[PDB]
Design an enzyme around this catalytic site. Structure first.
Site, PDB file in Angstrom:
ATOM      1  N   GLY A  46       1.992  -2.796  -1.975  1.00  0.00           N
ATOM      2  CA  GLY A  46       1.228  -2.244  -0.744  1.00  0.00           C
ATOM      3  C   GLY A  46      -0.032  -3.102  -0.762  1.00  0.00           C
ATOM      4  CB  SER A  49      -0.354  -0.676  -6.422  1.00  0.00           C
ATOM      5  OG  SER A  49       0.447   0.160  -5.102  1.00  0.00           O
ATOM      6  CD  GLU A  50       2.538  -7.430  -7.450  1.00  0.00           C
ATOM      7  OE1 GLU A  50       2.962  -7.539  -8.388  1.00  0.00           O
ATOM      8  OE2 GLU A  50       2.453  -8.390  -6.511  1.00  0.00           O
ATOM      9  CB  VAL A  51       6.061  -0.070  -7.035  1.00  0.00           C
ATOM     10  CG1 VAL A  51       6.930   0.694  -7.802  1.00  0.00           C
ATOM     11  CG2 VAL A  51       4.826   0.427  -6.380  1.00  0.00           C
ATOM     12  CG  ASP A 154       0.477   7.313   3.211  1.00  0.00           C
ATOM     13  OD1 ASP A 154       0.600   7.049   4.557  1.00  0.00           O
ATOM     14  OD2 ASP A 154       0.504   6.331   2.380  1.00  0.00           O
TER      15      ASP A 154
END
Ligand code: 3NG
Length: 327
Positions: A46, A49-51, A154
């Site tokens: 996003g 962040s990175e997941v 959200d």
């Protein structure tokens, strides 16, 4: 200026909690051992962040690791504190650990893994009973966080992870969540476009838990009518116009008038005049099996311009729509 507003429920939950509970800026992070976790595959990223899917090598269990981008420091402790406050609550994603990533040099949050089905695929297959069942599960999560003084801000299909095999649901990504304090003005730049409440779209800052209930209503509409997303705006202004084509413009003016809010004058030449529509307008042969009078009344009571008029999560769980769901 604008007329003030208060949540009609859980109004003073945070005022009567210890300061430690909501004062996330003073939170001291407890760090785990970064070596416990081995990244397996990148799931996405996003703005913030990175997941990754990963493995906890102390139990060989699948986990998810969210590496926070070096952006907006303040938000880090806020998300962490909210996750810790809500841990163990019904259908709340579990924060398993927090470690320092040596490459990003930022915190990495380690979450329970959910074996989910992508909502794009899943919504195509949900039965009437399924929609009721999963809606009820989402409400459990929302009533919990609201009762704990927190709004998610959200709610949208991506953030509701569903394991359709075990009929298990988790509300994820609390990165936009906030503590509700009566009288507090909040950023209106929250939520995804299609799920933004009228309060955000008319720039009204003194909003509350009820924002999540609008978002839930948008999800429900997309599910029962098989139209995702339901209100399909091309930008934040057209988003409100799309809503007004369904709920009507007179009730929109009543809403802004009640709170002594003025529309952005840019709506002058795009808003028009629109009647309120009856929900049956959106029923057709391909979605009718998902629709019932109970569904439409429940939907109608979620999707109100006036955030104060919307069903609360707890009230929603009392709705006849859920009578058929096995408890
Ligand atoms: O942010 C959290 O709270 C958060 C917490 C848990 C998950 C997550 C995000 N994202 C997942 N998947 C995913 C799929 C596509 C794109 C992105 Cl970025 C992530 C995921 C999958 C399975 N189990 C738990 C999670």
């Amino acid at each position: 200026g604008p007329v003030p507003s208060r949540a009609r429920v859980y109004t003073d939950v945070n005022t009567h909690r210890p300061r430690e509970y909501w004062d996330y800026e003073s939170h001291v992070v407890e760090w785990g051992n970064q070596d416990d976790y081995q990244l397996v595959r990148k799931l996405g990223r996003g703005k913030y962040s990175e997941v990754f899917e990963a493995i906890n090598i102390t139990n060989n269990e699948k986990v998810v690791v969210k590496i926070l981008k070096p952006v907006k420091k303040k938000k880090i402790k806020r998300e962490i504190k909210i996750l810790e406050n809500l841990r163990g609550g019904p259908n709340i994603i579990t924060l398993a650990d927090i470690v320092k990533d040596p490459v990003s040099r930022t915190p990495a949050l380690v979450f329970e893994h959910v074996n989910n089905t992508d909502f794009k695929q899943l919504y195509q297959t949900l039965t009437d009973y399924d929609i009721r069942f999963y809606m009820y599960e989402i409400l459990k999560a929302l009533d919990y966080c609201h009762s704990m003084g927190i709004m998610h801000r959200d709610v949208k299909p991506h953030n509701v992870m569903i394991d359709h095999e075990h009929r298990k649901l988790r509300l994820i990504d609390w990165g936009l969540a906030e503590f509700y304090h009566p009288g507090q003005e909040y950023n209106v730049r929250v939520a995804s476009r299609y799920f933004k409440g009228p309060e955000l779209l008319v720039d009204y800052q003194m909003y509350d838990y009820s924002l999540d209930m609008w978002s839930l209503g948008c999800m429900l509409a997309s599910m029962i009518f098989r139209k995702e997303p339901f209100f399909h705006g091309h930008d934040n202004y057209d988003q409100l116009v799309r809503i007004a084509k369904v709920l009507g413009t007179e009730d929109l003016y009543d809403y802004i008038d009640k709170y002594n809010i003025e529309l952005d004058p840019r709506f002058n030449d795009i808003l028009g005049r629109h009647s309120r529509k009856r929900w049956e307008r959106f029923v057709h042969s391909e979605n009718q099996h998902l629709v019932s009078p109970e569904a439409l009344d429940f939907l109608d009571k979620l999707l109100r311009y006036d955030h104060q008029s919307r069903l609360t999560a707890r009230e929603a769980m009392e709705h006849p729509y859920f009578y058929t769901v096995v408890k």
